[PDB]
PDB file of C-alpha atoms and ligand atoms in Angstrom:
ATOM      1  CA  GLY A   1      14.876   2.085  22.807  1.00  0.00           C
ATOM      2  CA  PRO A   2      13.722  -1.462  21.669  1.00  0.00           C
ATOM      3  CA  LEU A   3      13.559  -2.134  17.928  1.00  0.00           C
ATOM      4  CA  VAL A   4      10.173  -2.654  16.309  1.00  0.00           C
ATOM      5  CA  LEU A   5      10.224  -4.346  12.969  1.00  0.00           C
ATOM      6  CA  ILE A   6       7.667  -4.637  10.228  1.00  0.00           C
ATOM      7  CA  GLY A   7       7.601  -6.072   6.748  1.00  0.00           C
ATOM      8  CA  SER A   8       6.153  -4.586   3.587  1.00  0.00           C
ATOM      9  CA  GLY A   9       5.486  -6.838   0.610  1.00  0.00           C
ATOM     10  CA  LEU A  10       7.294  -9.804   2.167  1.00  0.00           C
ATOM     11  CA  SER A  11       6.358 -13.402   1.370  1.00  0.00           C
ATOM     12  CA  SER A  12       5.149 -15.693   4.145  1.00  0.00           C
ATOM     13  CA  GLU A  13       8.679 -17.209   4.243  1.00  0.00           C
ATOM     14  CA  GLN A  14      10.146 -13.757   4.551  1.00  0.00           C
ATOM     15  CA  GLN A  15       7.719 -12.772   7.403  1.00  0.00           C
ATOM     16  CA  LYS A  16       8.706 -15.948   9.361  1.00  0.00           C
ATOM     17  CA  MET A  17      12.351 -15.006   8.858  1.00  0.00           C
ATOM     18  CA  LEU A  18      11.617 -11.490  10.106  1.00  0.00           C
ATOM     19  CA  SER A  19       9.954 -12.953  13.255  1.00  0.00           C
ATOM     20  CA  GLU A  20      12.964 -15.225  13.709  1.00  0.00           C
ATOM     21  CA  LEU A  21      15.205 -12.154  13.656  1.00  0.00           C
ATOM     22  CA  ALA A  22      13.017 -10.166  16.077  1.00  0.00           C
ATOM     23  CA  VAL A  23      13.573 -12.964  18.557  1.00  0.00           C
ATOM     24  CA  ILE A  24      17.379 -12.817  18.023  1.00  0.00           C
ATOM     25  CA  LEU A  25      17.415  -9.048  18.437  1.00  0.00           C
ATOM     26  CA  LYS A  26      14.913  -8.944  21.403  1.00  0.00           C
ATOM     27  CA  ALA A  27      12.767  -6.767  19.134  1.00  0.00           C
ATOM     28  CA  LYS A  28       9.080  -6.592  18.282  1.00  0.00           C
ATOM     29  CA  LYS A  29       7.716  -7.651  14.962  1.00  0.00           C
ATOM     30  CA  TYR A  30       4.391  -6.201  13.949  1.00  0.00           C
ATOM     31  CA  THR A  31       2.014  -6.610  11.092  1.00  0.00           C
ATOM     32  CA  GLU A  32       0.337  -3.227  11.432  1.00  0.00           C
ATOM     33  CA  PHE A  33       2.246   0.065  11.253  1.00  0.00           C
ATOM     34  CA  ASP A  34       2.510   2.185  14.321  1.00  0.00           C
ATOM     35  CA  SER A  35       4.595   5.244  15.250  1.00  0.00           C
ATOM     36  CA  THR A  36       6.831   2.898  17.383  1.00  0.00           C
ATOM     37  CA  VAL A  37       8.086   1.090  14.273  1.00  0.00           C
ATOM     38  CA  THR A  38      11.787   1.627  13.848  1.00  0.00           C
ATOM     39  CA  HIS A  39      12.585  -0.637  10.819  1.00  0.00           C
ATOM     40  CA  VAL A  40      10.519  -1.479   7.694  1.00  0.00           C
ATOM     41  CA  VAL A  41      11.862  -4.345   5.637  1.00  0.00           C
ATOM     42  CA  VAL A  42      11.065  -4.669   1.873  1.00  0.00           C
ATOM     43  CA  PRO A  43      11.482  -7.830  -0.255  1.00  0.00           C
ATOM     44  CA  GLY A  44      14.033  -6.698  -2.784  1.00  0.00           C
ATOM     45  CA  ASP A  45      16.215  -3.566  -3.126  1.00  0.00           C
ATOM     46  CA  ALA A  46      13.414  -1.086  -3.844  1.00  0.00           C
ATOM     47  CA  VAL A  47      10.785   0.825  -1.925  1.00  0.00           C
ATOM     48  CA  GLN A  48       7.177  -0.356  -2.093  1.00  0.00           C
ATOM     49  CA  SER A  49       4.446   2.166  -2.918  1.00  0.00           C
ATOM     50  CA  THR A  50       2.365   0.856   0.016  1.00  0.00           C
ATOM     51  CA  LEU A  51       0.931   2.595   3.054  1.00  0.00           C
ATOM     52  CA  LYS A  52       3.334   0.799   5.336  1.00  0.00           C
ATOM     53  CA  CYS A  53       6.313   1.897   3.450  1.00  0.00           C
ATOM     54  CA  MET A  54       4.995   5.452   3.062  1.00  0.00           C
ATOM     55  CA  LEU A  55       4.273   5.697   6.775  1.00  0.00           C
ATOM     56  CA  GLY A  56       7.786   4.351   7.395  1.00  0.00           C
ATOM     57  CA  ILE A  57       9.287   7.057   5.249  1.00  0.00           C
ATOM     58  CA  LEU A  58       7.184   9.852   6.866  1.00  0.00           C
ATOM     59  CA  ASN A  59       8.370   8.527  10.256  1.00  0.00           C
ATOM     60  CA  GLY A  60      12.089   8.459   9.234  1.00  0.00           C
ATOM     61  CA  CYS A  61      12.327   4.732   9.909  1.00  0.00           C
ATOM     62  CA  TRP A  62      15.053   2.504   8.509  1.00  0.00           C
ATOM     63  CA  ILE A  63      13.676   1.197   5.187  1.00  0.00           C
ATOM     64  CA  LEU A  64      15.896  -1.778   4.518  1.00  0.00           C
ATOM     65  CA  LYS A  65      16.376  -4.360   1.825  1.00  0.00           C
ATOM     66  CA  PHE A  66      15.566  -7.976   2.753  1.00  0.00           C
ATOM     67  CA  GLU A  67      19.264  -8.832   2.497  1.00  0.00           C
ATOM     68  CA  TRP A  68      19.546  -7.158   5.920  1.00  0.00           C
ATOM     69  CA  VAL A  69      17.383  -9.889   7.491  1.00  0.00           C
ATOM     70  CA  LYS A  70      19.530 -12.593   5.827  1.00  0.00           C
ATOM     71  CA  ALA A  71      22.719 -10.982   7.012  1.00  0.00           C
ATOM     72  CA  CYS A  72      21.569 -10.419  10.573  1.00  0.00           C
ATOM     73  CA  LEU A  73      20.351 -14.010  10.844  1.00  0.00           C
ATOM     74  CA  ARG A  74      23.590 -15.412   9.529  1.00  0.00           C
ATOM     75  CA  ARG A  75      25.516 -13.325  12.087  1.00  0.00           C
ATOM     76  CA  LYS A  76      22.974 -13.247  14.969  1.00  0.00           C
ATOM     77  CA  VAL A  77      23.628  -9.541  15.104  1.00  0.00           C
ATOM     78  CA  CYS A  78      21.869  -6.312  14.212  1.00  0.00           C
ATOM     79  CA  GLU A  79      23.886  -5.517  11.045  1.00  0.00           C
ATOM     80  CA  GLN A  80      24.658  -1.888  10.344  1.00  0.00           C
ATOM     81  CA  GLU A  81      21.443  -0.524   8.901  1.00  0.00           C
ATOM     82  CA  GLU A  82      22.957   2.127   6.621  1.00  0.00           C
ATOM     83  CA  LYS A  83      24.617  -0.523   4.503  1.00  0.00           C
ATOM     84  CA  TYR A  84      21.189  -2.024   3.547  1.00  0.00           C
ATOM     85  CA  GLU A  85      19.049   1.130   3.454  1.00  0.00           C
ATOM     86  CA  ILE A  86      17.045   2.014   0.364  1.00  0.00           C
ATOM     87  CA  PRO A  87      18.405   5.178  -1.138  1.00  0.00           C
ATOM     88  CA  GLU A  88      16.734   8.424  -2.155  1.00  0.00           C
ATOM     89  CA  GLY A  89      13.488   9.082  -0.179  1.00  0.00           C
ATOM     90  CA  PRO A  90      13.925   6.684   2.770  1.00  0.00           C
ATOM     91  CA  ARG A  91      17.477   7.798   3.440  1.00  0.00           C
ATOM     92  CA  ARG A  92      16.830  11.466   3.141  1.00  0.00           C
ATOM     93  CA  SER A  93      13.971  11.147   5.622  1.00  0.00           C
ATOM     94  CA  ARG A  94      15.930   9.075   8.120  1.00  0.00           C
ATOM     95  CA  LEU A  95      18.659  11.707   8.124  1.00  0.00           C
ATOM     96  CA  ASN A  96      16.059  14.442   8.411  1.00  0.00           C
ATOM     97  CA  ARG A  97      14.674  13.024  11.613  1.00  0.00           C
ATOM     98  CA  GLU A  98      18.029  12.148  13.132  1.00  0.00           C
ATOM     99  CA  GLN A  99      18.800  15.882  12.845  1.00  0.00           C
ATOM    100  CA  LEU A 100      15.486  16.756  14.470  1.00  0.00           C
ATOM    101  CA  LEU A 101      14.419  18.795  11.450  1.00  0.00           C
ATOM    102  CA  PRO A 102      10.785  19.519  10.407  1.00  0.00           C
ATOM    103  CA  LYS A 103       8.637  16.701   8.995  1.00  0.00           C
ATOM    104  CA  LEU A 104       7.992  16.693   5.229  1.00  0.00           C
ATOM    105  CA  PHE A 105       4.652  18.511   5.404  1.00  0.00           C
ATOM    106  CA  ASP A 106       5.497  20.903   8.228  1.00  0.00           C
ATOM    107  CA  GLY A 107       3.741  24.271   7.622  1.00  0.00           C
ATOM    108  CA  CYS A 108       1.362  22.639   5.046  1.00  0.00           C
ATOM    109  CA  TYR A 109      -2.379  22.229   5.156  1.00  0.00           C
ATOM    110  CA  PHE A 110      -4.511  19.802   3.151  1.00  0.00           C
ATOM    111  CA  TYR A 111      -8.208  19.742   2.256  1.00  0.00           C
ATOM    112  CA  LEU A 112      -9.454  16.503   0.797  1.00  0.00           C
ATOM    113  CA  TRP A 113     -11.916  17.322  -1.944  1.00  0.00           C
ATOM    114  CA  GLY A 114     -14.437  14.963  -3.514  1.00  0.00           C
ATOM    115  CA  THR A 115     -14.593  11.189  -3.659  1.00  0.00           C
ATOM    116  CA  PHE A 116     -11.622   8.880  -2.961  1.00  0.00           C
ATOM    117  CA  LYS A 117     -11.608   5.255  -3.999  1.00  0.00           C
ATOM    118  CA  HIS A 118      -8.225   4.330  -5.314  1.00  0.00           C
ATOM    119  CA  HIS A 119      -6.296   6.386  -2.782  1.00  0.00           C
ATOM    120  CA  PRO A 120      -8.466   5.658   0.258  1.00  0.00           C
ATOM    121  CA  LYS A 121      -9.309   8.859   2.147  1.00  0.00           C
ATOM    122  CA  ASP A 122      -8.235   7.179   5.408  1.00  0.00           C
ATOM    123  CA  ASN A 123      -4.809   6.599   3.871  1.00  0.00           C
ATOM    124  CA  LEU A 124      -4.329  10.148   2.838  1.00  0.00           C
ATOM    125  CA  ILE A 125      -5.309  11.463   6.334  1.00  0.00           C
ATOM    126  CA  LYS A 126      -2.817   9.039   7.913  1.00  0.00           C
ATOM    127  CA  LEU A 127      -0.103  10.239   5.590  1.00  0.00           C
ATOM    128  CA  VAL A 128      -0.894  13.943   6.104  1.00  0.00           C
ATOM    129  CA  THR A 129      -0.724  13.612   9.833  1.00  0.00           C
ATOM    130  CA  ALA A 130       2.310  11.320   9.772  1.00  0.00           C
ATOM    131  CA  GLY A 131       4.160  13.917   7.631  1.00  0.00           C
ATOM    132  CA  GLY A 132       3.400  16.743  10.050  1.00  0.00           C
ATOM    133  CA  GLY A 133       0.750  18.408   7.884  1.00  0.00           C
ATOM    134  CA  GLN A 134      -2.648  19.669   8.972  1.00  0.00           C
ATOM    135  CA  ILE A 135      -5.977  18.290   7.625  1.00  0.00           C
ATOM    136  CA  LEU A 136      -8.582  20.970   6.925  1.00  0.00           C
ATOM    137  CA  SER A 137     -12.306  20.297   7.607  1.00  0.00           C
ATOM    138  CA  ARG A 138     -13.397  23.356   5.543  1.00  0.00           C
ATOM    139  CA  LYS A 139     -12.181  24.356   2.056  1.00  0.00           C
ATOM    140  CA  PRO A 140      -9.358  26.889   2.479  1.00  0.00           C
ATOM    141  CA  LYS A 141      -9.969  30.544   1.663  1.00  0.00           C
ATOM    142  CA  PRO A 142      -8.287  33.902   2.624  1.00  0.00           C
ATOM    143  CA  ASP A 143     -10.975  35.060   5.125  1.00  0.00           C
ATOM    144  CA  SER A 144     -10.368  32.034   7.312  1.00  0.00           C
ATOM    145  CA  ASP A 145      -6.624  31.592   6.606  1.00  0.00           C
ATOM    146  CA  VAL A 146      -4.648  30.930   9.783  1.00  0.00           C
ATOM    147  CA  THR A 147      -1.372  31.700   7.985  1.00  0.00           C
ATOM    148  CA  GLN A 148      -2.141  35.354   8.323  1.00  0.00           C
ATOM    149  CA  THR A 149      -1.855  35.032  12.181  1.00  0.00           C
ATOM    150  CA  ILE A 150       1.817  33.980  12.133  1.00  0.00           C
ATOM    151  CA  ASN A 151       4.475  33.618   9.446  1.00  0.00           C
ATOM    152  CA  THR A 152       3.998  30.094   8.082  1.00  0.00           C
ATOM    153  CA  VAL A 153       6.531  28.460   5.772  1.00  0.00           C
ATOM    154  CA  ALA A 154       7.220  24.977   4.487  1.00  0.00           C
ATOM    155  CA  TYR A 155      10.772  23.991   5.341  1.00  0.00           C
ATOM    156  CA  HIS A 156      10.875  21.301   2.616  1.00  0.00           C
ATOM    157  CA  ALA A 157       9.783  23.579  -0.192  1.00  0.00           C
ATOM    158  CA  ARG A 158      12.541  24.378  -2.655  1.00  0.00           C
ATOM    159  CA  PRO A 159      14.233  27.795  -1.828  1.00  0.00           C
ATOM    160  CA  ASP A 160      12.714  29.863  -4.554  1.00  0.00           C
ATOM    161  CA  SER A 161       9.362  28.028  -4.928  1.00  0.00           C
ATOM    162  CA  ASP A 162       6.094  29.683  -4.134  1.00  0.00           C
ATOM    163  CA  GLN A 163       5.412  26.521  -2.159  1.00  0.00           C
ATOM    164  CA  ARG A 164       7.698  27.968   0.561  1.00  0.00           C
ATOM    165  CA  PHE A 165       4.914  30.297   1.535  1.00  0.00           C
ATOM    166  CA  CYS A 166       1.872  29.147  -0.477  1.00  0.00           C
ATOM    167  CA  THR A 167       1.447  26.029   1.660  1.00  0.00           C
ATOM    168  CA  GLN A 168      -2.242  25.112   1.370  1.00  0.00           C
ATOM    169  CA  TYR A 169      -3.485  22.233  -0.838  1.00  0.00           C
ATOM    170  CA  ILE A 170      -6.735  21.135  -2.219  1.00  0.00           C
ATOM    171  CA  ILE A 171      -6.182  17.409  -2.959  1.00  0.00           C
ATOM    172  CA  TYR A 172      -8.405  15.611  -5.525  1.00  0.00           C
ATOM    173  CA  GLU A 173      -8.275  12.046  -6.793  1.00  0.00           C
ATOM    174  CA  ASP A 174      -6.617  12.207 -10.204  1.00  0.00           C
ATOM    175  CA  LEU A 175      -8.144  11.414 -13.612  1.00  0.00           C
ATOM    176  CA  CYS A 176     -11.746  12.329 -12.679  1.00  0.00           C
ATOM    177  CA  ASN A 177     -11.591  14.149 -16.083  1.00  0.00           C
ATOM    178  CA  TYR A 178     -10.376  17.123 -13.948  1.00  0.00           C
ATOM    179  CA  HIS A 179      -7.284  19.187 -14.731  1.00  0.00           C
ATOM    180  CA  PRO A 180      -7.700  22.678 -13.190  1.00  0.00           C
ATOM    181  CA  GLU A 181      -7.551  25.902 -15.210  1.00  0.00           C
ATOM    182  CA  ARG A 182      -5.131  27.434 -12.647  1.00  0.00           C
ATOM    183  CA  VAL A 183      -3.191  25.224 -10.334  1.00  0.00           C
ATOM    184  CA  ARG A 184      -2.919  28.066  -7.747  1.00  0.00           C
ATOM    185  CA  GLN A 185      -5.162  30.741  -6.345  1.00  0.00           C
ATOM    186  CA  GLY A 186      -3.586  32.808  -3.654  1.00  0.00           C
ATOM    187  CA  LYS A 187      -1.942  30.532  -1.172  1.00  0.00           C
ATOM    188  CA  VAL A 188      -3.977  27.509  -2.216  1.00  0.00           C
ATOM    189  CA  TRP A 189      -2.889  24.919  -4.848  1.00  0.00           C
ATOM    190  CA  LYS A 190      -5.016  22.246  -6.411  1.00  0.00           C
ATOM    191  CA  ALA A 191      -3.034  18.988  -6.603  1.00  0.00           C
ATOM    192  CA  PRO A 192      -3.879  15.370  -7.514  1.00  0.00           C
ATOM    193  CA  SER A 193      -3.535  12.643  -4.937  1.00  0.00           C
ATOM    194  CA  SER A 194      -0.843  11.163  -7.222  1.00  0.00           C
ATOM    195  CA  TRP A 195       1.321  14.244  -6.611  1.00  0.00           C
ATOM    196  CA  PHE A 196       0.971  13.883  -2.833  1.00  0.00           C
ATOM    197  CA  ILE A 197       1.969  10.246  -2.974  1.00  0.00           C
ATOM    198  CA  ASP A 198       4.958  11.059  -5.188  1.00  0.00           C
ATOM    199  CA  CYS A 199       6.109  13.696  -2.573  1.00  0.00           C
ATOM    200  CA  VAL A 200       5.958  11.019   0.160  1.00  0.00           C
ATOM    201  CA  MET A 201       7.792   8.322  -1.885  1.00  0.00           C
ATOM    202  CA  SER A 202      10.519  10.872  -2.713  1.00  0.00           C
ATOM    203  CA  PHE A 203      10.523  12.726   0.651  1.00  0.00           C
ATOM    204  CA  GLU A 204      10.249  15.901  -1.384  1.00  0.00           C
ATOM    205  CA  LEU A 205       7.789  18.712  -1.701  1.00  0.00           C
ATOM    206  CA  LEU A 206       7.713  18.394  -5.418  1.00  0.00           C
ATOM    207  CA  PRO A 207       6.924  21.466  -7.492  1.00  0.00           C
ATOM    208  CA  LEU A 208       3.475  22.137  -8.981  1.00  0.00           C
ATOM    209  CA  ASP A 209       4.425  25.345 -10.995  1.00  0.00           C
ATOM    210  CA  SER A 210       7.863  24.302 -12.115  1.00  0.00           C
TER     211      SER A 210
HETATM  212 CL1   CL B 301       3.930  37.380  12.070  1.00  0.00          CL
END
């Protein structure tokens, strides 16, 4: 298809330059993230811990250093994206979706507990859904647990982690003076919002017990 570009953390001069490139490439340039976005450009050589970037990772977009815009504009060409792609999380996710593999939170369920202020609740719901996870409207417990109705696993869990098959998460906003006594009860973990965000930024289902 058509390319759809967006910038995260770009200066005004950078955003103009991105629009200039979209014209050269016959592409769209947006300011709000959408599932049609193909390319997220960052200002330097590092991922931004922003919603736009995180949505771009969960979508397996190209997350590219601003040098890509400079290079394309000097050549009037869509330069080869892999040579400008941010490594680690972005790249692993891009490859994951090219191979039509499960999204990061496939087989995972999330219940958003308590008050959210510094990780907006809307943001977390966006990210859950974008990563292929399921938002729960009632606190998870065994007598209502859908994972008994069909074998449910989390593809991105490490091989030998309980998170392969214990895939349900109570998420709380960290540092409310709350560390739990047990991080896991049955199939349900209690995890801070800061863990969830770290999983996204890394494209990993990071361990809670190990
Ligand atoms: Cl079964």
